[PDB]
Every structure is written in structure tokens, then in C-alpha cells.
Amino acid sequence: SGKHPLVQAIENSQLKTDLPEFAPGDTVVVQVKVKEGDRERLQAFEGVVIAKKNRGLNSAFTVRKISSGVGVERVFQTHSPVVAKIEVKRRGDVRRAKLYYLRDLSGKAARIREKLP
Amino acid sequence: MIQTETMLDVADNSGARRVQCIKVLGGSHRRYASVGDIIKVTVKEAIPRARVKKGDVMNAVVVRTKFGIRRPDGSVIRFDDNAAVILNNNKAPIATRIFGPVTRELRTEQFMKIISLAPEVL
Amino acid sequence: AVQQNRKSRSRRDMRRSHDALTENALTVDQATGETHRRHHVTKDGFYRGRQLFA
Amino acid sequence: AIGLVGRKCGMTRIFTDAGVSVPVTVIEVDPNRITQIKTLETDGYQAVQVTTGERRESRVTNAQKGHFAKAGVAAGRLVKEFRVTEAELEGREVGGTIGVDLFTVGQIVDVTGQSKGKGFQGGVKRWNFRTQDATHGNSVSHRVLGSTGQNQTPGRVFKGKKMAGHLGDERVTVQGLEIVSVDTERSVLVVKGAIPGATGGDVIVRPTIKA
Amino acid sequence: MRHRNSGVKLGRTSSHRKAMFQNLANSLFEHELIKTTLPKAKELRRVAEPLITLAKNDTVANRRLAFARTRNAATVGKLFTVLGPRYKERNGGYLRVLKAGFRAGDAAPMAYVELVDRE
RNA sequence: CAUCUCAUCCUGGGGCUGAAGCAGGUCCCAAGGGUAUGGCUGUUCGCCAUUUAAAGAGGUACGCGAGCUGGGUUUAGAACGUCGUGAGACAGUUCGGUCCCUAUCUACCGUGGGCGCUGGAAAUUUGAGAGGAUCUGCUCCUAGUACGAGAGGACCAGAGUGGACGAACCUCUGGUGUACCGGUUGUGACGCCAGUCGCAUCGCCGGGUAGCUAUGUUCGGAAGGGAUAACCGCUGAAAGCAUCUAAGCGGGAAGCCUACCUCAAGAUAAGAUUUCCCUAGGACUUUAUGUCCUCUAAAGAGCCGUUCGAGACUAGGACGUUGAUAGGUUGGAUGUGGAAGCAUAGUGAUAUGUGAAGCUGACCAAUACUAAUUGCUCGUGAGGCUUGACU
RNA sequence: GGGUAAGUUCCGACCUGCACGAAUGGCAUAAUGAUGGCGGCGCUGUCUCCAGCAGAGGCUCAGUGAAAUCGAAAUCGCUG
RNA sequence: GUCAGGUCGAGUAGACCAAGGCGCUUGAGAGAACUCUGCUGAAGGAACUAGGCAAAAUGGUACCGUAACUUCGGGAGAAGG
RNA sequence: AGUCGGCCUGCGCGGAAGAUGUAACGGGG
RNA sequence: GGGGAGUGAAAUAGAUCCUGAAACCGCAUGCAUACAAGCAGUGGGAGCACCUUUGUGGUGUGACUGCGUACCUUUUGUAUA
Ligand SMILES: [Mg+2]
Ligand SMILES: [Mg+2]
Ligand SMILES: [Mg+2]
Ligand SMILES: [Mg+2]
Ligand SMILES: [Mg+2]
Ligand SMILES: [Mg+2]
Ligand SMILES: [Mg+2]
Ligand SMILES: [Mg+2]
Ligand SMILES: [Mg+2]
Ligand SMILES: [Mg+2]
Ligand SMILES: [Mg+2]
Ligand SMILES: [Mg+2]
Ligand SMILES: [Mg+2]
Ligand SMILES: [Mg+2]
Ligand SMILES: [Mg+2]
Ligand SMILES: [Mg+2]
Ligand SMILES: [Mg+2]
Ligand SMILES: [Mg+2]
Ligand SMILES: [Mg+2]
Ligand SMILES: [Mg+2]
Ligand SMILES: [Mg+2]
Ligand SMILES: [Mg+2]
Ligand SMILES: [Mg+2]
Ligand SMILES: [Mg+2]
Ligand SMILES: [Mg+2]
Ligand SMILES: [Mg+2]
Ligand SMILES: [Mg+2]
Ligand SMILES: [Mg+2]
Ligand SMILES: [Mg+2]
Ligand SMILES: [Mg+2]
Ligand SMILES: [Mg+2]
Ligand SMILES: [Mg+2]
Ligand SMILES: [Mg+2]
Ligand SMILES: [Mg+2]
Ligand SMILES: [Mg+2]
Ligand SMILES: [Mg+2]
Ligand SMILES: [Mg+2]
Ligand SMILES: [Mg+2]
Numbered sequence A: 001s002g003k004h005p006l007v008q009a010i011e012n013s014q015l016k017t018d019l020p021e022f023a024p025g026d027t028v029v030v031q032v033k034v035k036e037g038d039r040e041r042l043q044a045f046e047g048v049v050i051a052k053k054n055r056g057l058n059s060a061f062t063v064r065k066i067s068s069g070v071g072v073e074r075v076f077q078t079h080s081p082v083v084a085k086i087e088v089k090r091r092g093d094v095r096r097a098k099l100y101y102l103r104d105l106s107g108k109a110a111r112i113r114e115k116l117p
Numbered sequence B: 001m002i003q004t005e006t007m008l009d010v011a012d013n014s015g016a017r018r019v020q021c022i023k024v025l026g027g028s029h030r031r032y033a034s035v036g037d038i039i040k041v042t043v044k045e046a047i048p049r050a051r052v053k054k055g056d057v058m059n060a061v062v063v064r065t066k067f068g069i070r071r072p073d074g075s076v077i078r079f080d081d082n083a084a085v086i087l088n089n090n091k092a093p094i095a096t097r098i099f100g101p102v103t104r105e106l107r108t109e110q111f112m113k114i115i116s117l118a119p120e121v122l
Numbered sequence C: 001a002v003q004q005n006r007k008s009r010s011r012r013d014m015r016r017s018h019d020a021l022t023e024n025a026l027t028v029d030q031a032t033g034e035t036h037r038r039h040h041v042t043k044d045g046f047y048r049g050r051q052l053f054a
Numbered sequence D: 001a002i003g004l005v006g007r008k009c010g011m012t013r014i015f016t017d018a019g020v021s022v023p024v025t026v027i028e029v030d031p032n033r034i035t036q037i038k039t040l041e042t043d044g045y046q047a048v049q050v051t052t053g054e055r056r057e058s059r060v061t062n063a064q065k066g067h068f069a070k071a072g073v074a075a076g077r078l079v080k081e082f083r084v085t086e087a088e089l090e091g092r093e094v095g096g097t098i099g100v101d102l103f104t105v106g107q108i109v110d111v112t113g114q115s116k117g118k119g120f121q122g123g124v125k126r127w128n129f130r131t132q133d134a135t136h137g138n139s140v141s142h143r144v145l146g147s148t149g150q151n152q153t154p155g156r157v158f159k160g161k162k163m164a165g166h167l168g169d170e171r172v173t174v175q176g177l178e179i180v181s182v183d184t185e186r187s188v189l190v191v192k193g194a195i196p197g198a199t200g201g202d203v204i205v206r207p208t209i210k211a
Numbered sequence E: 001m002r003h004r005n006s007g008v009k010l011g012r013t014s015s016h017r018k019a020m021f022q023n024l025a026n027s028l029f030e031h032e033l034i035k036t037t038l039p040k041a042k043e044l045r046r047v048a049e050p051l052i053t054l055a056k057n058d059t060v061a062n063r064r065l066a067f068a069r070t071r072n073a074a075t076v077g078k079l080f081t082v083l084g085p086r087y088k089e090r091n092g093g094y095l096r097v098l099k100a101g102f103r104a105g106d107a108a109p110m111a112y113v114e115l116v117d118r119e
Numbered sequence F: 001c002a003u004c005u006c007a008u009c010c011u012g013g014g015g016c017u018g019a020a021g022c023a024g025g026u027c028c029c030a031a032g033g034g035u036a037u038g039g040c041u042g043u044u045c046g047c048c049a050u051u052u053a054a055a056g057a058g059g060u061a062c063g064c065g066a067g068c069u070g071g072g073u074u075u076a077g078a079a080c081g082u083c084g085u086g087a088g089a090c091a092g093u094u095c096g097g098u099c100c101c102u103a104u105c106u107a108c109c110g111u112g113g114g115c116g117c118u119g120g121a122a123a124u125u126u127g128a129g130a131g132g133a134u135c136u137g138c139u140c141c142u143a144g145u146a147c148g149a150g151a152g153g154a155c156c157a158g159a160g161u162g163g164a165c166g167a168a169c170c171u172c173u174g175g176u177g178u179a180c181c182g183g184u185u186g187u188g189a190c191g192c193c194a195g196u197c198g199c200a201u202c203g204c205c206g207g208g209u210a211g212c213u214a215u216g217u218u219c220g221g222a223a224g225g226g227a228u229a230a231c232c233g234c235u236g237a238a239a240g241c242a243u244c245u246a247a248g249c250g251g252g253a254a255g256c257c258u259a260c261c262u263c264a265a266g267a268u269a270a271g272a273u274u275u276c277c278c279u280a281g282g283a284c285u286u287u288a289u290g291u292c293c294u295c296u297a298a299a300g301a302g303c304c305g306u307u308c309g310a311g312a313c314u315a316g317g318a319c320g321u322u323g324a325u326a327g328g329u330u331g332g333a334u335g336u337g338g339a340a341g342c343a344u345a346g347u348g349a350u351a352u353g354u355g356a357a358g359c360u361g362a363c364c365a366a367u368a369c370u371a372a373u374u375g376c377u378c379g380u381g382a383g384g385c386u387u388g389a390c391u
Numbered sequence G: 001g002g003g004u005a006a007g008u009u010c011c012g013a014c015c016u017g018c019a020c021g022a023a024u025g026g027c028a029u030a031a032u033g034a035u036g037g038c039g040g041c042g043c044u045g046u047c048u049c050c051a052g053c054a055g056a057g058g059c060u061c062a063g064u065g066a067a068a069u070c071g072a073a074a075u076c077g078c079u080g
Numbered sequence H: 001g002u003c004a005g006g007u008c009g010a011g012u013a014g015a016c017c018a019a020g021g022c023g024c025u026u027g028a029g030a031g032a033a034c035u036c037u038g039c040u041g042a043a044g045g046a047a048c049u050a051g052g053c054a055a056a057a058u059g060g061u062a063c064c065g066u067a068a069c070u071u072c073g074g075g076a077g078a079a080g081g
Numbered sequence I: 001a002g003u004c005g006g007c008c009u010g011c012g013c014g015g016a017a018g019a020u021g022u023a024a025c026g027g028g029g
Numbered sequence J: 001g002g003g004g005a006g007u008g009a010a011a012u013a014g015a016u017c018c019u020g021a022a023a024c025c026g027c028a029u030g031c032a033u034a035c036a037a038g039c040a041g042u043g044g045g046a047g048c049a050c051c052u053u054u055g056u057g058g059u060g061u062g063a064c065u066g067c068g069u070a071c072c073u074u075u076u077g078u079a080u081a
Helices: A005-012 A100-104 B112-117 C009-016 D062-070 D123-127 E014-031 E038-055 E060-070 E073-086
Strands: A027-035 A040-053 A060-067 A070-077 A083-090 B007-010 B016-024 B038-046 B057-064 B076-079 B083-087 C026-028 C035-037 D004-015 D021-028 D032-038 D047-052 D078-083 D108-114 D117-121 D165-168 D171-183 D188-192 D202-207 E033-037 E095-102 E109-115
Touching: A005 D004, A005 D021, A005 D188, A040 A070, A040 A083, A040 A100, B007 B057, B016 B057, B016 B083, B038 B083, D004 D047, D004 D188, D021 D171, D032 D062, D078 D202, D117 D123, D123 D165, E014 E033, E014 E038, E014 E060, E014 E073, E033 E038, E038 E060, E038 E073, E038 E095, E038 E109, E060 E073
Parallel strands: B007 B083
Antiparallel strands: A027 A040, A027 A083, A040 A060, A060 A070, A070 B076, B007 B016, B016 B038, B038 B057, B057 B083, C026 C035, D004 D021, D004 D202, D021 D188, D032 D047, D047 D078, D108 D171, D108 D202, D117 D165, D171 D188, E033 E109, E095 E109
16 A cells, blocks of 8 residues: 555455465465476475565565475465465464574574464 | 585585585676586585595585575575585586485476485475 | 966956856735745744734 | 557566566556647658646646647647657547557567666766775775776877766666556556656657567 | 655754754744744654644653653643644644744744744 | 777688588688686786686787875895995895875866847757667577488577676565664663653664665567678670670678667757747937837746755756645554553562554655745847749 | 695795805794784675665855966867 | 762773763755765675785683693683583 | 780789878868 | 045045055946857958048957967977977
């Protein structure tokens, strides 16, 4: 809503309608459409949301996982059709909006507390 | 974004631990090597009993960068390290084990083996 | 850093040919007959039929 | 070739069904009104003069008032000419309108606009000059030009020497852009890529001349 | 470049600038008519009018916000007892800025800032 | 930071070959573009390492210190070897050792004012001309074909994807974001508790909206036409033959002219089109675009104001009440991350609820609340003459 | 020979010492040195390659008001 | 040469304050290049350069631990945790 | 049906590549 | 600081006071000057203005045009950069 109404009307015709309510600190599974040529399949990318940007069609969220000993960060565009599905496994209890400090912790130090009703 | 003097982790079992890029190949005045680019390296650290010795000038291919790869949908994929895989004189991977994940930009005829041996292909 | 010849008086005047001043925009106020600078308050505190410091 | 006059409304993205994200610029196209047609017998060249937008009547001089009243159009905020050919002038006529449906999806176009003005700029920003060393005994010259010539032959500075000066705010054409969408109900073009200027600036869209 | 940027500098650090506009707003709320330089007067709108908008509703949290932005207890009292109630149904525009010639020692252009329904 | 030459390093076009193909050797034409990063050394050079299509040769005060540096060399200190009785010295070596100038003129890069342009004005333009750009790799296909004993391995033509360079832009990815939010140390103050301000590099730390920006994103060097270089000709005499040449007719290059982009009528040859404005009286002779007096003040321009994604100042763009130009207000969006107060639990630090709350520069949209005035100045009164055409 | 992918420097050797050498001392030496040379870890805008921001000048306005220089100037280019 | 308070502090270091004294005798705008002085900076990390010049970095207290070599004192706050 | 190739000479041709701009008739020509 | 008035033979003899030069700096009038390249003059020369005259006159200016690289010193020789 920081844009002109015409840009808004254009970018609102392609918003996704069913997105889960996730916040930074939540562990999520993102299904990603992969094309190995003619084959179409889903890949699961599971990790902690460390950043979440709210811009309507320009929204995004960063997910950090630790695969095979190596840290991987993936930024997903929320309304991209390659994001087939987002599933919230567990919710975290953080005190900031960006958990960039997790980039410098490992293992026991990088644990996030679980949010409980 | 690998340039000359960058140090890389070796993402295979060829015997090297640390390498250092001394040339970005494929064009005059070429500055950087991204994931999938071929690189001239020198071996800085090696395991004691290996096929690769410290001081060897070799080829390698970049498989992980901290700067990240763009995807057509607008995504970035970043890794916590820079990693390369040593190759032959004719640009073929000399490894039998790949460590850590890799990306699908390596899905070509020459690097098929790297994909087949990787524990995870992002 | 410095001139090699003294500049003639004619070139000095030709340089100053752009130095002239302009008059200001003055209007006669109708509520006081006064002359003031346009869009400015008068020195008596009047502006467009309104008074400051009665 | 006849084109459109629009306004850069801003940038967005369009997601394709295959997941590709496409950076796009939205051009708002108030339907252009043909004010004049220039032919060979009267002007010495063929062109279509068109107006778009609106201008309040107190900002329209009497000359332009009569020039718009001769045609059957209302005063716009700017008037522009397009150099055309015959057989590109068949159903064109004064008082007619040239709308957004003159373009097709996938058609390649050139967009002309006025680039953003950066004011007075030095060699580094304006000519990609290299800076001198920041700290190795370097004196008070880091972003300066360096040498501007040679010694006593020629004993002058050559014309076209790249120096500091005013940068930007020029007329720029980007060729080879693709029409991503033609919304005729919103009177909007959506083109792939970046177009010169700031949001709200005037842009000319023409069919590509490279062909 | 300065494209779309808001705010002034006036040859002061941001601490000095914040302090000086605090002082100016206190002075204006106390006298309701002051004479200052024209650029200072034009930036004083963006500082002093949100204070009145804040003082329209009288809560302890609002009075504490007003004190944090003015650090003057008499200014807060006057905002919430006089100036707030006065401009209750006025939608902005509580200040009036009028150009007032030039300073003698400076030739700096001047302006009067006054409150709208004062006196 | 350059600019030129061509005796060409690559790329382009050819002749010959001890030219099978691939690849070379050599000569001719060709200066459009391009033409490494490092280790050593004060080095230029050179050697080496690894690239590249290539890592050209030169001129320019061995281009460039009123642009930078000061490692070498060539002041004064000191030492070694050597020479000298010595003061001292060097076919030498070693450690250390102040780099001034606010730019008048020319030049150059930008940006204005004046006047001119055969009455004035507001627009839109033509293009004489000028500048910019001009590079190239690899893969696939043709085709494992032509060629070759095999090995190997094409021309021509097509498609794709790169490097370097350039431009624009900020949707994305990031950076910054000292007027946005939060945490926290010390100290002082607000009477005090609470709350929250000042100062400590923005105190420090963590995020971050616009704008700007690259490392981000898109685009560019496409195709064509004309005249040619070397070269290849056709027909053809001089010279019964031959012969590209004398007559005549062709082909032919990254080069030339166009073509693409930008500027451009101070192009004084000052161009074109559309529209708009001005139609009053007298007197006096120097009898002529003559002078003075009265009446007139247009189209429009400027001053001034609110301003701007425009800007050093300018200029340029928008608006000035019959108005959204700026601010404010309202709503939204965003960012931050759970305000204060109160309650509750706890010995307390603290936690929870009220409530994703509170606050939120620069954004979007509405909204005359504040400020853009009632004005003034400039710009005139139908635009000389001579010919020729229509009238 | 070592060190580096690559070392005119460095270190260890060799001895062909142009032209070392024993109180103008020879060869070593713990500690010490704002001492000379070389190498490494960390760290970095030193750099690739620069971007943003803050303050102070620069710029505009008001006030005050220098300097060196200077035969006189109606003070362009190119080729000679 | 003398005096020299508070909080914390080993301190006459330092941060903020008291008593006391001051705002440094041109200002106002604007917020271009360029210069100076700072702050931050993706990826890399000496490839810079004559030379890591300059910057960045380290940094307190207690405890553990500390090599070669040595003139037996050191080295040594070695290093590091 | 004239043709061949030797001399001696007048005037021409090639041999003939450079760096700011034609630039080796002062220029137009 | 000045304008009058007054004094004085005189006040552009008024105290920065006899005379009051030049450089240098104003204002007024006439003519020239915004398509044109250089030691700034010289030879010619239209036009305009003002005086006068019945001028083949005078005074100012100078469109256009041919020619034309200061002076001194020192030198074999200097526009000499
Ligand atoms: Mg004069
Ligand atoms: Mg200095
Ligand atoms: Mg400096
Ligand atoms: Mg703004
Ligand atoms: Mg100042
Ligand atoms: Mg501060
Ligand atoms: Mg040649
Ligand atoms: Mg070298
Ligand atoms: Mg030189
Ligand atoms: Mg030296
Ligand atoms: Mg961006
Ligand atoms: Mg940003
Ligand atoms: Mg308290
Ligand atoms: Mg203090
Ligand atoms: Mg708001
Ligand atoms: Mg708080
Ligand atoms: Mg070295
Ligand atoms: Mg000796
Ligand atoms: Mg002896
Ligand atoms: Mg002796
Ligand atoms: Mg080294
Ligand atoms: Mg001249
Ligand atoms: Mg010359
Ligand atoms: Mg102290
Ligand atoms: Mg960095
Ligand atoms: Mg980093
Ligand atoms: Mg180096
Ligand atoms: Mg170097
Ligand atoms: Mg240092
Ligand atoms: Mg430091
Ligand atoms: Mg006298
Ligand atoms: Mg006298
Ligand atoms: Mg003239
Ligand atoms: Mg002599
Ligand atoms: Mg001599
Ligand atoms: Mg002579
Ligand atoms: Mg002389
Ligand atoms: Mg001279």
C-alpha cells in the first residue's frame, strides 16, 4: 500500500489466498516444486524462519537449516508458485523480528524456545 | 563470488582440506567464479596419505558459495562456507565421496557424478 | 595561480556586466494604504486584513 | 512508427505459471488524442501529433487553446509527434484516439524517457574513473581526475575529454523490451525490464526499430 | 543527491537540532507568537503540530509522551488544558507562518509563527 | 587520465605454399573495437606462475609531480670494502633523510545572462552538422560428413550460452539508512517511586521505512543498403594470339558512407508547420518605419509565493483558491516487537494478561485546516522598400 | 637447498674472500631496541571496487576584506 | 609554584556532575563535484604497496596454563584458556 | 601482310611506411 | 556629512584649508560596437553627429580595406618561450 493504486491492482490479482500464520522463530517445512527435466516433484526444505518480510506480492521469508554439517539459508518469495505449501511444525518464542544471530551459533546454543499458549 | 586468494573448503575426499583460488578461468579480466565455475587452485592443507599433495596446482569446480545463487523465481540460496571439488586435467571430478550439499546448477554432462554422489542436491 | 598580464579595465567591467541588482516585489496594501513587500507582513504587523500585536 | 505516450507508474513483478519471476514496469496510458497530421504537401514530412492527459484551462495559453480547438480534442499536459509512413496512416485522422491496444503481448518495443538527474558529478560516478590510492602517502587527491593531457604537444586539452559535469536528466532509449501484458480496461501497458526516469515521468513507447 | 528526502540540517548536529526545535516549540506554546528565521519556522510545523494532535486526548500515557518530547512540565500542562481543548475539532493547521522581512545584523529572512485562534 | 601512427598482436578479407583435412609458413589489404592477473626486484626490462581471441610495436618534454607518490638516483648523519699520510673520495655498497602555489588568459567539462533571427507570442518540429557505440569466447547442429591409409578432422550455413565493456533501473538479493523501533552500561536531572530525557563516537548493541546504491535486475553492440581495398572476374582490342582494361560490364572486408542512439537552426544560410494578439486621436516639420502630446497596455513573459523524483547559483517542471503545490490531519501500509497504567503470580530479580500492543522520517490515498493576495513590471497600437505573380 | 603456484629480497650451505680477519678488535651471545631484512596467525575499505550516511569547508545571501603577479593586449585550432 | 569536591574507580586515568566559569566577536541558507574529519559496509581478505603505510584488531580482574634459549635474574602478561 | 629485338636519347611509372589535422603547389583551383 | 544664511576680495580660500599635475576611479553627451580572429597602429575610406558656411571648411567618431610579431639590454643572430 506504499505503491500507486494501479500497481496495487496489478499486483493483487496474483496474491496467494491460503498462507499459514508463521512468525520468525517457527520451524516450517516448505514444499518446493522441482523439475528434473520432464519430471515434476516436491522437495521438502525444513528449518527455522529467521526473517520475514511483509510487502504483499513482494513478501519473503528466510529459512535456515543445517544440512550435512553445512548451514544453508534459503530466501523464499511467499507468493511464488514454486512454494507449493508451507507447514508450521513448531512455534518459537523470540524477542526480535530477525534472528540473524543464529547465523553465528551452532547446536545447543542455537536452540529456540517453544511458544506455548 | 570466488576471486584469486580466496580460500575454499574441499567438499570431497580427494585428500585436500584447504585450497586457494589462483585463477578464475574462462575469459580475460574475469573477476569472480560462482557455483559451477571452474577454478585454478593450489592445495594449502592436505591429509597425510593422499593422492593430492600440498603445493599442487589443480583444477576445481565451485559447489558452494557464501554469496549465494539466484533462482528464477527471485530466491537466494546461501551456504555458510565456500567449497570446491577437485577435477582432472580434462575437467572431471576425481572424487568418490561428496560432502555437504550442492545445488542443481551442476546438472550437466561433466558434473553428473558430483550430483550423483552428493548427500543433498538443493 | 596568478595572472601573467594585468587585466585591462575593459575586461574587468565586462566581468562586472552581470553584477547589477534587482528591485523587490512591492505592493500597496489596501487595508492600510501602506507599501510592503509582497507576501510579507508590514512593519505595523498587518497582512491580508489581519493584525498581529494589537 | 506510431507509438504511445504514457507515465511510468512504478515497478512490480509478474509470476509465471512455471514459477519464473519477471521484473516489470507499469506504464499508465491515458488514451492519446490525435491533434494534428503532417503530410508531405504541407510540412515536408509525415507525422502524427498527439496529446495525452489533461491541463487546466488557466494553464493553457490562447495559442494552444486554438490549436486544440481546431481539432476536436481537449488540452493535454504535453504534445508529441510520431514520425510515421503511409499505410501507417490509413485509419488515422484528427480527433481520433490511439489507445493501448496498438500493442500486442510479446511484441518488442523501445521505451524513451528522461533519466533521473544526479546533478553535478565527478569522474568516478560520471565516467567510471578509478580512484587513486586511499592511504599510501596519497595527498588530498583521491577522487580527482588525474592527468588531463600531455606536455606542450599538443599543449591543450582535447575536445570530448571526460571531466566532471552534470549527469543524468537526459533523454534515454531502452530497446528490446517485451510487452508482458496489455490491460485495456485499466489502460495500462506492463513491459518487462526497467525504463528510464522516475515514477510519474513521461515515457514514449514505440515498436522496436531493430525489427 | 537528496531525492525525496525530508528534514533539515541548519548547520547543526542532530542533537543540537532536536534540542533547538524542542526549545522553539516550548517558546511558541508559551507565547503563542514568536519571530524566527523562515526555514526554522517552516520546520517548526512538523515538530509543534504533532504535539497538539497528541494533546487532543488526555491520558497519562499521552501526557508522558508529551513530556518526553518537550521536557517542560508547564508546556505539558498548557498543551493538555488549553491548547488541546482549543483545537479539538480543527483538522491540522494549528500554526500560521508569515514572512516578516529580514534580520538587520544578518539579512536572514524572518517569519512570525502564531497559533491560529490565539488572543 | 590519455591521444595519435601502422612497420598488425587478435578479430575481418585475399595470393602463394614443400596448402590432403586440422593446423601452419609467408606475402598483400585492413587502425573499427580489443589487447592479462600475480611472485621477485625502486625498477623500465627480464625471468617465472597461471590465464587469454590476443597479452602488438612505437610517438606524444623517453605524454602526464601548478594531478598524486617519492621506492632509486643526486645535499647535510653514519658505517663497510677500497684508495689516500691526511682533509677526504668512489667502476661501489649499507641504514636514515621537509615534494609550495586560493587559476588571470588559452584549452576543456558543465551551466546561464544578452542580443540577433524583416511585428509580437505559445507550441510542435526538419536536420546541414556533431558526438557515442563498433570487442570477442565456448557448446550444439550441419557431421564424425568432405578430406585422410589411419590418426584425426573441416569450409559454408544455423541455434544457444558466456567473458569484458556500456547504459538504464531499484521489482528482486544486499549495503547504507546519526530525524523510525527496541535492548543495555555509567552518570546527572526531571521533588521522590515509577516513568524517561541529557551526555558518553549515533555511548554501545540489534533490527529497519523511503532515497541513494552494486555485488542486484533488465537491455545493448541486430539486420540491412551504397561505394570500395587487396584480390577474383566477364567480354575485349592495342599486339591475327594472349590479356580483368585501353572502351564496356561485374564481384569483393570487423575498414568508408549510411544504418542504431543522443545533441543539433548563433545552420547569421538564423529553416518549417499550427494556433493566438494588437485596427486611437491629434498637432509640428528634417517629408519619413520623422518628432512630440493625449488615449491605449493585448497575446504573452517575468517578478513574487507553495514547491519538485529538477538543481551549486541558475535553468527546467508543477501549482497559486474556479487550488491537492507544500505542510498538517484522517485512513492505510510498513518497521519495531508485547507501550504506559492497572491487575495477577512470585521473597525478589522477573513473568503473564489487558493487547501483536504502543510508537512508527522520507511512502500511498483522501482531506482546504495552514500557507500559496488583493498585485506590479515588461511586452503595444496591423509590422520599410523594390520587383514578380496571382489579384 | 628451504620457503611460495611463481622469491633479484630472506634463511641454510658452498668458497672462486675483485677487495674479511683479530682492541680503527674477530667470532658468538641471554636480555634490551619507536633499529634494519624476511615469514606467519588474527584482523581488516590497503585493495578487487567502491556505496551510503554524519559534521566541517566548497556553493548562494548579508557584512568586512587580503595575497603573490603584472611591457601592453581586440589573449582560438592546425600545418609550416 | 599552590588548591582541587561528588558517583564509580588503584588513581591527580576516565565518563557524567558540584562550586565556580563559560558558549571560544561574522552570521543566514543550501545540502552539487571535490577536500578534510568520522561511522557502517555484501563476497573476498594484503590480491594493495617500495613496504600491511594507514586503518581494523588486541586490551580489565581472578584463576588455570605457558616453549626454545639463558648470563639462572629472565624469556613471561610467552603462547593460550 | 609487314614483322622481329639491339642501341642512344625527351618526358613519364613502380621502388615510396609515422605518429594533434588535409599538411611534400602558400591556398583555391 | 551636507544645503542655505552670514563673513570675506575670494569659501571647488571652510580648517584633510595657497596652487592643486599624473597615475587611478566616477557620471554625462556624440559616434562606434553582439558572423567576427593576432603588438591594437598606419595608409585609405563610407556613414553619422555637432559647429559653422554657402567650404575642395572645421571638430568627434570610424563600417570596410592594403600593410604591419612592443621597447630595452646582450648577442653571430631575438616577436622570441
Ligand atoms: Mg566607463
Ligand atoms: Mg602535505
Ligand atoms: Mg587524505
Ligand atoms: Mg519530500
Ligand atoms: Mg555555516
Ligand atoms: Mg550524542
Ligand atoms: Mg598496412
Ligand atoms: Mg611482471
Ligand atoms: Mg616523461
Ligand atoms: Mg628516496
Ligand atoms: Mg533495491
Ligand atoms: Mg534500502
Ligand atoms: Mg526512578
Ligand atoms: Mg559535560
Ligand atoms: Mg500518518
Ligand atoms: Mg520503552
Ligand atoms: Mg616481498
Ligand atoms: Mg675491518
Ligand atoms: Mg694484532
Ligand atoms: Mg687493530
Ligand atoms: Mg608475501
Ligand atoms: Mg578576440
Ligand atoms: Mg598551437
Ligand atoms: Mg579528566
Ligand atoms: Mg567488507
Ligand atoms: Mg562480512
Ligand atoms: Mg603483493
Ligand atoms: Mg601489484
Ligand atoms: Mg600501523
Ligand atoms: Mg584504531
Ligand atoms: Mg579655484
Ligand atoms: Mg586647496
Ligand atoms: Mg554586426
Ligand atoms: Mg646569451
Ligand atoms: Mg648565444
Ligand atoms: Mg625576426
Ligand atoms: Mg620577453
Ligand atoms: Mg608570450
